[PDB]
Design a protein around this nucleic acid. Structure first.
Lengths: 32, 442, 65
RNA sequence: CGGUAAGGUGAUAUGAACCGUUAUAAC
RNA sequence: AAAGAACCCCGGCGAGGGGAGUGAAAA
RNA sequence: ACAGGUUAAUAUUCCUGUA
RNA sequence: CGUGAUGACGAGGCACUACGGUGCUGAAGCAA
């Protein structure tokens, strides 16, 4: 298995990704 | 002792021993798929709306898309895996995985490196002049996003890998190529139209429909395989009864042909990917170690001799160039292939158990099936080739698939077609495992 | 040395089997076509999904660029 | 050669592959 | 009329049995 | 038609060497 | 008795291995 002392539930990575999208999706576009 | 400290700091994915319904593995996969396509729609935050064309060579095997939140794509992950297979391959760092140690060592380790290669590539990309404006400030910002997007994939892969079907990478690649096709041929600036319109305009352009053909031909060819099964068997077996489903049986076949060397060639092509990148990079940022690019790609040097010819039409105007590449690829394939042995691959040891039960044994009755139980050498022998064969077979095919040249990437189409079929199989082994909650190993 | 010989032989021995394994339907007036079907069908879905998600926007990014 | 006909390839006998539905299925 | 007892449990992936359903009835 | 050799199971029967 | 046979086999070693076992090599090899 994995020696990853930390456990991360997928629901997070998904939501964290919805994060990158929103941020840059607006950080870039929607100028001004 | 090992890099266990930071290694234990690198997050992972919570694998539930709960009930993960087929319907859920499916629905999961799909969510990953979309966040992907989506990320491929979003440009990287960068004022310099002006970018120097594109690297028509890295995108395909990398499943990336330069200029987007995934401009680096699977590229790192592949790079990383490439090194590992290189070290743990040429014995340089001999390891007998067997024990959950070496196994989880080889892995965990590689994973880390993937994040290392995640940033490296990022920097290398911008440093290769993938965007044009090297505003130390803006440059930094970009790299951030870039490698971080690739990170998300690394974790999205993990998700699919433990919450859905098939594989992230495998998926991702097929995801990209498929799209690259449906869009290139039919999308906005679609080719089918540019051709169709060119017909209406009255100036039939054979160059607009061409690439579309290239893809059919490849697909048809690439497909050729995965059909050379070999109806055989079989054994005898026994046991009740019986009204309808009774009489003893066993297992049939054949199964198919090709694939195995699916990850191998992915690495060969990916090696070349990191050369054309690493050469241009270490070109407009140093000395011409690898080759003199100019014009974007390379027009001389190791780089030149190792640049796949595809795109639209095959290039005859350089025979020698062809020859070398081919042979160059071929051998590189053999390599990673062998390095896949020292590691792991379509093994008879494994097929032994499972090709020695189909039937019965037991106490009740005398159902035959001697098999079997000491006759494995018959596989490892008949086996060797199967996967292969190889660095010239597949690798050859892949390469020649590029001379011909096609939409999405001759080679890309290949992997895809395979990945897609190995993905169909996955969907079946599942549609069934969703019945008898046990035979999760037959 | 010998290593090369054996390797070269194995390839030949295999080529021989390919000869025996064919009859059926070379392979079957349904098999081959199958792979291409499932394969093409799969690529279509993945490709289609990419189009729906793709293009769609490109129209906005350009209409708002 | 005649009758007959949506059903058939005798039984334990399922399955598999096929043959027929209008006048060379089968009986 | 096979609807000849899916599935769950003890038991030696036994024997046998207890539930659960089929059935007008498993008296 | 002999002596070696060989199969999980065949043998002056199959392989080899020599009749 | 020659030859068959500078061939084979051959104590034992160098190898893998599932632990049924398998490869490379190889001394003496005569007389009463």
């Amino acid at each position: 298995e994995t020696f990853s002392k930390i456990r991360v539930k997928p629901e997070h990575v998904i939501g964290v990704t919805v994060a990158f999208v929103i941020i840059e999706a607006i950080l870039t576009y929607g100028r001004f | 002792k090992k890099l266990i400290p930071i290694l234990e700091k690198i997050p992972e994915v919570e694998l539930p021993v709960k009930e993960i319904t087929f319907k859920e593995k499916l629905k999961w996969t799909g969510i990953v798929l979309v966040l992907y396509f989506i990320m491929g729609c979003i440009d990287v935050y960068t004022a310099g709306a002006q970018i120097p064309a594109i690297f028509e060579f890295w995108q395909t095997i990398t499943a990336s898309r330069i200029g987007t939140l995934i401009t680096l794509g699977i590229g790192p992950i592949v790079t990383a895996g490439i090194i590992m297979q290189l070290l743990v391959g040429s014995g340089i760092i001999q390891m007998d995985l067997s024990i959950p140690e070496n196994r989880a060592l080889f892995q965990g380790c590689q994973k880390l490196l993937s994040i290392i290669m995640c940033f490296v590539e990022a920097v290398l990309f911008v440093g290769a002049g993938a965007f044009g404006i090297l505003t130390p400030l803006l440059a930094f910002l970009v790299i951030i996003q870039i490698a971080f997007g690739s990170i998300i994939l690394i974790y999205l892969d993990e998700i699919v890998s433990k919450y859905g079907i098939g594989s992230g990478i495998g998926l991702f690649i097929a995801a990209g190529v498929s799209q690259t096709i449906f869009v290139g041929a039919l999308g906005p600036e679609g080719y089918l139209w540019k051709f169709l319109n060119s017909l209406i305009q009255g100036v039939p352009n054979i160059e607009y429909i061409a690439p579309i053909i290239g893809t059919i031909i490849v697909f048809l060819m690439v497909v050729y395989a995965e059909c050379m099964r070999r109806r055989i068997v079989v054994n005898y077996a026994k046991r009740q009864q019986g009204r309808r489903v009774y009489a003893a049986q066993s297992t049939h076949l054949p199964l198919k042909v090709v694939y195995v060397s699916n990850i191998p060639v992915i690495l060969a092509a990916a090696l070349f990917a990191n050369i054309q990148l690493w050469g241009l990079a270490l070109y407009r940022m140093g000395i011409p170690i690898l080759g003199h690019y100019e014009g974007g790609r390379a027009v001389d040097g190791i780089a030149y001799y190792l640049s796949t010819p595809y795109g639209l039409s095959s290039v005859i105007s350089d025979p020698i160039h062809a020859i070398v590449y081919m042979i160059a690829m071929i051998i590189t394939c053999v390599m990673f292939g062998i390095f896949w042995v020292e590691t792991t691959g379509l093994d008879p040891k494994s097929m032994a158990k499972r090709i020695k039960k189909s039937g019965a044994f037991v106490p009740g009755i005398r159902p035959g099936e001697q098999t079997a139980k000491y006759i494995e050498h018959r596989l490892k022998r008949y086996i060797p080739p199967l996967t292969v064969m190889s660095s010239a077979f597949v690798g050859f095919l892949a390469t020649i698939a590029n001379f011909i040249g096609a939409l999405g990437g001759g080679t890309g189409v290949l992997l895809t077609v395979s990945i897609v079929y190995r993905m169909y199989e996955q969907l079946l082994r599942e549609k069934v495992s969703e019945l008898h909650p046990a035979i999760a190993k037959l | 040395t010998k290593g090369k010989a054996t390797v070269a032989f194995a390839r030949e021995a295999r080529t021989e089997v390919r000869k025996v394994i064919w009859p059926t339907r070379k392979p079957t007036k349904d098999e081959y076509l199958a792979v291409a079907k499932v394969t093409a069908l799969g690529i279509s879905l993945l490709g289609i999904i990419g189009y729906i998600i793709h293009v769609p926007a490109t129209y906005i990014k350009g209409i708002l660029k």
